[PDB]
Design a protein around this ligand. Structure first.
Ligand SMILES: *C1=CC(=O)O[C@@H](/C=C/C(=C\[C@H](C)C/C=C/C(C)=C/[C@@H](C)C(=O)[C@@H](C)[C@H](O)[C@@H](C)C/C(C)=C/C(=O)O)CC)[C@H]1C
Ligand SMILES: Nc1nc2c(ncn2[C@@H]2O[C@H](COP(=O)(O)OP(=O)(O)NP(=O)(O)O)[C@@H](O)[C@H]2O)c(=O)[nH]1
Ligand SMILES: [Cl-]
Ligand SMILES: [Cl-]
Ligand SMILES: [Cl-]
Ligand SMILES: [Cl-]
Ligand SMILES: [Mg+2]
Lengths: 205, 121, 1016
């Protein structure tokens, strides 16, 4: 049960960060531009069984575009990303959509306005209307705060499985093992760890 | 988690130490639970991410483990875990776990230590 | 690896190998896929790669291979077409066309290879953009001809035309020059007559075909731009609105076309056209009712079920109804025979508005807003919609989203808890709902009241009791505040409160209580007008809130704090005065008991509390009385302070974390009170000021000591973060006060010298990681407010922070992000208010200033970039303003061309697109300076050029050369043409910008037409 998801949108909108968050739980602060595409599998557990996305996280920077629309071939769904602190990124949404739907004529698509955690919002809620005539689902999201982070995948899952009552469910938790040379190096490793500051110590959690 | 008694629950943020890089990396935010298996009397940590409910921590509270402070925080513990199966196959990690307050951190430590004693029996 | 073979062009392309590479990429996984991906990208990007296209198309057995082939061509065609020998262009045209034909004639291919056909079509369209009609005049007539010979070809022609129309009318602005755009729009227009004829025929001689769908798809595009006669003077409206509505495969597209029609440019005085606009709507609605669903249908249920394309259809229906009605509903409002239709359309909307789907709801809500706003003003219209509006009141009241003030929420386990985070994405939704409901209330206040009062009574008697129901209702009631007359409001509010208190008594347990509390607080907070006329009531409310401040329920507790300040913000005057039958103004009562009241609150909550009290105190306009109140309010923090100041001045050993927190909270409290009291805060500020600056110093010493003893890592520690919080809060306090200060003389005479003395050297002489950006922020406000009064001070500020800050932020764009932002804000205001400070800088420092500005341009971070551009513009103005003097002269000689080239660089690199406008402005200003002979010295040096040579002539020459070298693929004439246009246009920004935009198009291709820059 696996579906191809293409992820498109302007450079710096948070596409890769968003994905990584889902993959590993982490938040990547650094902007390292995607080169062409990165394919990542991504599984979710639902009341209707597991669902697998093969996430094709494409480059937003023209100069790192690679095959561009070639990535879209046989996509079964998609996420178009923009950055609510950057108006140009919203302006470019219909360009991304155009290129996308030309290859993928009848797929479910989520429009996502990222980085809403940022105080000085520039693309006003009210302005976000492109999705309506195009039948795209829309969500305000933040990869940083995790605001609505699950929503795009839940929606897409419901549309692809064809079950509106689909929910994420807790995976059963296998009893973990009772385990017990390295003792020496573990001392060293622990030291380095203890004395490396934890990030964002000014967050709530 | 049907066979398990919830000894302690607390909202937390879990990190893993990327050794290669030299940074802490978030592994998940959610309810960290101490669970006692009713049949075996073993106590584990089980932690799931908000919303996705994905397991980000699943390991026994080994007697051998020690909660250490982090230089940056008055509300976190760091410790070596030799067998976490959250991701699947048993794997070693250096974990950090941060709480909403010092009180909560201090409560976790106490609970952790008790659990360790239970596991010893 | 084996796969890399395709990269070696010195050997024939192994097509079989290519196909493997491609399969590996698309169908493969992990390392293999990844390698293949890189290999393919390398191949594609190879500038001769295109030469292999024909070979691939012919010999590949993998459609993705061919697709890729087509992407390569597309890149070549769009970028380098006119670089190609003529023969190569023809050849490419021919094999692209041939391929299309060949794929259309083979049915199996046509049916199963749509992706590849679609790509091919687009590739062709790219050729047309280059070649048509000037070098392909017969394309259309032959396209037309070919269409009758084959159903596949014909259908495919429709796709081609849809793409062409898109590329020409919808997506041309960013992608073509003004001239070329016009040319192709004109060309499409001149031949549309024939295009349409084909389109109409096909539509007539068919029912529900893929050909019909394709045709209809193309119609959707054409509708964006075709003249209205094509729509209104043919039978097309009848077809769309009857025939094509009945079959579902055509329905979706038809409805979208009809939506676009409902926006056509259309005369207003033409009765017959009105009739046609009425008729298609009437037809359309008739088809819905008979072929899809009746008006009574449960659209909520249908949507929720999500069969087939139901959600989409419902969405498109909403879009259709809302668009049409918004524009045309007046056509239906007067004629009695049209009444049913008008109302039925609305009834559909009502039904759609019950659907559970936020975004869809917003769409419908926007329509309702439009409607009610109109009904509120337009004479004799509201009565038409009375029943519609009545049903609408229900829908909205029952779908009220949680206001931002309501801080409690139900968790997954059915517990009423404090929210984890703000629901940021429902802020606008609430405003929209409130707006519509306000209007609805005004339209019929009796109805609205009866609805609410009886819904409420059904909560009390338990019949309808639930969290959701009391909530949505309470929120609704709160949201309509203002809509009634004071007198009407009075009775209404009395009834509501009585009932809510009733519920409070009947509904027990902690979760229930949390819910009812939240609801009451929201309601009371929303009716200040009421509170102001009912002192006893108000007083009792506040006291109750204080009780909540000892709630173990954190959500309720927190809400009490916010509600308190929310009320105080509106009602403060009633707390400051002595009320009838009171012994003292209430503020006195609050202050006396402030320790008790706030004991269980979190610090920040305590600060909010103090802030509120500040609002009240500032109502007291008598100075003696006010100062006395301020004094009393500050009694506890001032006593804590006084004792702390003792212990630290004896010995700088504060090393206590507990003490640090105490101090931090003292300052924070001062900040809180200063925020609300502003200028009135001055006496309290003076009580602590000198000791506070001493404490700043003491703490600074600790931080440095700590870094020295422990390393940079010290800065991460709780201890050090704590000490810095003190410094930051101190900075914040002074900033806050100065920003609101009314007596600027005291600022300058009393505050500024010790401030500067305390903070500047410390900032300068700390290691980078120990430097607070907040210092920069403070200094901005200082310069902003009293900069004109402290020339020497401004100089001091610069000396102390300019170079050391610059050096932090000039290695990359990312490190020290706050410093970066505050840094350019500081420079901005200095440049604005105290330009003289920059005149005093040594030449070396001034050069770094110029560097600093340009560096700012190159940021993508908008906060930095925007300021950069502004500073540059202000600087140019500052210089201009000086007139023909040596400094101005030197400035231009050293820097005019640096600014011109830097500005050009960011304009043209494709990485600063957000700055286009301000870049353009700056550039235009710079060019206008020469064009207007506002630069008194030659911009060139002697022997470089003949002696008489005007700055205009030189500027041209510089620019032509810069562009020639920077963009060597441009022709001389292109450069010359561009520069002539641009310089001539240096007084008209909108035109100037269009010329810039055209240039940005031309630099992306080869062979751009120089005459394009004559567009007018
Ligand atoms: C249930 C349990 C709980 O713990 O708290 C409750 C929250 C109550 C709140 C506010 C209420 C409305 C404060 C009560 C005020 C009150 C009883 C004022 C009287 C002096 C008063 O004026 C009474 C007699 C009249 O009848 C009032 C109710 C209407 C008026 C003003 C009539 C008139 O003037 O003509 C929380 C903020 C709850 C959660
Ligand atoms: N504040 C905030 N920053 C974010 C968020 N999501 C991503 N970022 C930041 O934005 C920057 C760009 O993120 P990245 O994931 O590389 O975006 P991208 O769309 O993948 N860029 P590209 O298309 O070039 O591969 C990173 O520095 C990242 O930390 C967010 O939700 N909030
Ligand atoms: Cl294909
Ligand atoms: Cl006509
Ligand atoms: Cl008032
Ligand atoms: Cl030439
Ligand atoms: Mg990326």
């Amino acid at each position: 049960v696996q579906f191809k998801l293409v992820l498109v949108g302007d450079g710096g909108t948070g596409k890769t960060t968003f994905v990584k968050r889902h993959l590993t739980g982490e938040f990547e602060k650094k902007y390292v531009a995607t080169l062409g595409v990165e394919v990542h599998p991504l599984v979710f557990h639902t009341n209707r069984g597991p669902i697998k996305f093969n996430v094709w996280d494409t480059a937003g920077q023209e100069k790192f575009g690679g095959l561009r629309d070639g990535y879209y071939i046989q996509a079964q769904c998609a996420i178009i990303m923009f950055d609510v602190t950057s108006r140009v990124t919203y302006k470019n949404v219909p360009n991304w959509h155009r290129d996308l739907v030309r290859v993928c004529e009848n797929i479910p698509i989520v429009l996502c306005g990222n980085k809403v955690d940022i105080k000085d919002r520039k693309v006003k809620a009210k302005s976000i209307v492109f999705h309506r005539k195009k039948n795209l689902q829309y969500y305000d999201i933040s990869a940083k705060s995790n605001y609505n982070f699950e929503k795009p995948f839940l929606w897409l899952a419901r549309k692809l499985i064809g079950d509106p009552n689909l929910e994420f469910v807790a995976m059963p938790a296998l009893a973990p093992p009772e385990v017990v040379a390295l003792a020496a190096q573990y001392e060293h490793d622990l030291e380095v760890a203890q004395t490396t500051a934890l990030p964002d110590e000014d967050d709530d959690l | 988690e049907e066979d398990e008694e919830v000894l302690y629950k607390v909202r937390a943020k879990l990190f893993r130490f990327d050794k290669d890089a030299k940074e802490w990396k978030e592994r998940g935010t959610g309810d960290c639970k101490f669970l006692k298996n009713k049949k075996t009397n073993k106590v584990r940590i089980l932690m799931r991410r908000d919303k996705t409910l994905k397991i980000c921590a699943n390991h026994i509270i080994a007697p051998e483990y020690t909660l250490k402070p982090n230089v940056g925080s008055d509300r976190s513990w760091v410790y070596a875990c030799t067998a976490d199966i959250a991701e699947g196959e048993a794997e070693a990690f250096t974990f950090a776990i941060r709480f909403g307050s010092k009180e909560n951190a201090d409560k976790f430590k106490e609970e952790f230590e008790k659990a360790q004693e239970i596991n010893k029996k | 690896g084996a796969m890399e073979g395709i990269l070696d062009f010195s050997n024939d392309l192994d097509i079989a190998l290519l196909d493997q590479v491609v399969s590996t990429f698309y169908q493969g996984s992990g390392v293999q896929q990844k390698q293949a991906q890189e290999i393919l990208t390398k191949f594609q990007d190879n500038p001769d790669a295109w030469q292999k296209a024909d070979q691939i198309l012919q010999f590949s057995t993998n459609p993705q291979s061919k697709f890729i082939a087509l992407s390569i061509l597309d890149k070549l065609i769009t970028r380098k077409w006119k670089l190609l020998p003529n023969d190569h262009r023809i050849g490419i045209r021919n094999f692209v066309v041939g391929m299309i034909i060949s794929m259309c004639q083979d049915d199996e291919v046509f049916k199963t290879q749509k992706n590849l056909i679609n790509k091919s079509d687009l590739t062709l369209v790219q050729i047309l953009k280059q070649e048509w009609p000037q070098n392909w005049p017969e394309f259309i007539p032959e396209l037309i001809g070919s269409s009758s010979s084959s159903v596949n070809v014909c259908e495919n022609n429709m796709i081609v035309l849809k793409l062409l129309s898109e590329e020409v009318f919808d997506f041309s602005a960013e992608q073509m020059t003004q001239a070329k755009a016009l040319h192709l729009k004109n060309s499409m227009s001149k031949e549309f007559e024939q295009i349409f004829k084909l389109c109409f025929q096909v539509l007539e001689q068919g029912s529900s075909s893929s050909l019909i769908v394709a045709t209809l798809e193309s119609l959707l595009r054409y509708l964006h731009w075709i003249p209205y006669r094509y729509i209104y003077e043919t039978n097309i409206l009848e077809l769309l609105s009857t025939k094509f509505m009945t079959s579902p495969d055509t329905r979706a597209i038809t409805l979208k076309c009809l939506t676009e029609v409902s926006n056509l440019k259309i005369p207003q005085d033409n009765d017959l056209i009105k009739r046609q606009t009425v008729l298609f709507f009437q037809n359309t609605l008739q088809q819905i009712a008979t072929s899809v669903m009746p008006v009574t249908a449960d659209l909520k249920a249908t949507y929720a079920n999500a069969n087939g394309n139901d959600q989409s259809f419902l969405q498109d229906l909403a879009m259709f109804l809302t668009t049409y009605l918004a524009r045309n509903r007046a056509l239906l409002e007067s004629d009695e025979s049209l009444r049913e239709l008008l109302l039925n359309a609305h009834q559909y909307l009502i039904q759609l508005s019950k659907i559970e789907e936020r975004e869809l709801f917003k769409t419908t809500l926007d329509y309702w807003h439009n409607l009610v706003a109109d009904l509120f003003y337009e004479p004799l219209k509201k009565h038409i919609y009375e029943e519609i509006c009545s049903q609408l009141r229900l829908v909205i009241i029952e779908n009220m989203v949680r206001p931002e003030e309501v801080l409690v929420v139900e968790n997954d386990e059915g517990e009423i808890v404090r929210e984890f985070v703000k629901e940021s994405d429902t802020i606008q939704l609430y405003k929209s709902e409130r707006e519509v409901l306000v209007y609805l209330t005004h339209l019929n206040v009796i109805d609205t009241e009866e609805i609410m009062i009886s819904k409420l009574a059904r909560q009390i008697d338990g019949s309808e009791w639930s969290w959701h129901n009391i909530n949505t209702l309470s929120w609704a009631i709160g949201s309509i505040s203002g809509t009634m007359s004071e007198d009407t409001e009075k009775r209404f509010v009395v009834t509501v409160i009585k009932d809510l208190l009733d519920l409070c008594v009947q509904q027990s347990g902690q979760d229930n209580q949390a819910v009812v509390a939240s609801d009451i607080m929201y309601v009371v907070g929303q009716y200040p007008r009421f509170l102001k006329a009912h002192w006893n009531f108000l007083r009792t409310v506040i006291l109750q809130l204080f009780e909540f401040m000892h709630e173990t329920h954190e959500g309720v507790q927190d809400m009490a704090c916010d509600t308190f300040i929310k009320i105080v913000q509106k009602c403060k005057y009633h707390f400051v005065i002595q009320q009838p039958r009171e012994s003292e103004p209430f503020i006195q009562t609050i202050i006396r008991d402030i320790q008790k009241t706030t004991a269980d609150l979190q610090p920040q909550q305590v600060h909010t509390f103090y802030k509120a009290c500040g609002i009240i105190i500032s109502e007291e306009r008598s100075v003696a009385e006010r100062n006395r109140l301020l004094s009393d309010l500050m009694q506890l923090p001032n006593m804590a302070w006084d004792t702390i100041v003792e212990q630290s001045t004896a010995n700088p050993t504060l090393l206590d974390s507990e003490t640090v927190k105490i101090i931090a909270n003292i300052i924070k409290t001062n900040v809180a009170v200063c925020t609300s009291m502003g200028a009135d805060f001055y006496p309290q500020l003076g009580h602590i000021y000198y000791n506070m600056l001493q404490l700043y110093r003491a703490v600074s010493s600790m931080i440095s000591a700590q870094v020295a003893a422990e390393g940079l890592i010290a800065t991460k520690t709780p201890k050090v973060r704590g000490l810095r919080t003190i410094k930051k809060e101190i900075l914040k306090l002074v900033e806050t006060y100065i920003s609101k200060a009314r007596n600027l003389d005291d600022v300058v005479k009393v505050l500024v010298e010790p401030l500067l003395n305390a903070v500047l050297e410390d900032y300068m002489n700390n290691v980078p990681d120990a430097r607070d950006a907040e210092v920069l922020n403070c200094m901005t406000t200082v310069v902003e407010k009293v900069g004109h009064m402290i020339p020497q001070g401004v100089i001091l500020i610069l000396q102390s922070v300019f170079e050391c800050t610059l050096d932090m932020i000039n290695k990359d764009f990312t490190e020290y992000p706050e410093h970066r932002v505050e840094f350019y804000k500081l420079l901005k205001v200095i440049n604005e208010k105290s330009f003289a400070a920059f005149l005093e800088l040594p030449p070396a420092a001034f050069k770094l200033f110029v560097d600093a500005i340009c560096w700012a341009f190159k940021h993508n971070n908008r906060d930095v970039e925007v300021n950069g551009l502004q500073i540059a513009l202000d600087l140019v103005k500052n210089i201009e303003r000086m007139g023909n003097v040596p400094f101005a002269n030197e400035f231009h000689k050293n820097y005019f061309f640096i600014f011109v080239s830097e500005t050009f660089f960011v304009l043209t690199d494709s990485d600063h697109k957000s700055g286009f406008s301000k870049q353009a402005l700056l550039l235009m200003k710079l060019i206008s300076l020469v064009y207007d002979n506002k630069i008194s010295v030659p911009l060139y040096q002697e022997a470089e050029v003949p002696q008489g040579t005007s700055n205009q002539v030189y500027l041209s020459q510089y620019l032509a050369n810069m562009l020639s070298n920077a963009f060597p693929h441009l022709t001389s004439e292109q450069i010359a043409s561009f520069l002539s246009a641009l310089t001539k246009q240096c007084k008209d920004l909108v035109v100037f910008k269009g010329t810039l935009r055209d240039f940005l198009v031309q630099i992306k291709e080869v062979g751009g037409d120089p005459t394009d820059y004559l567009f007018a």
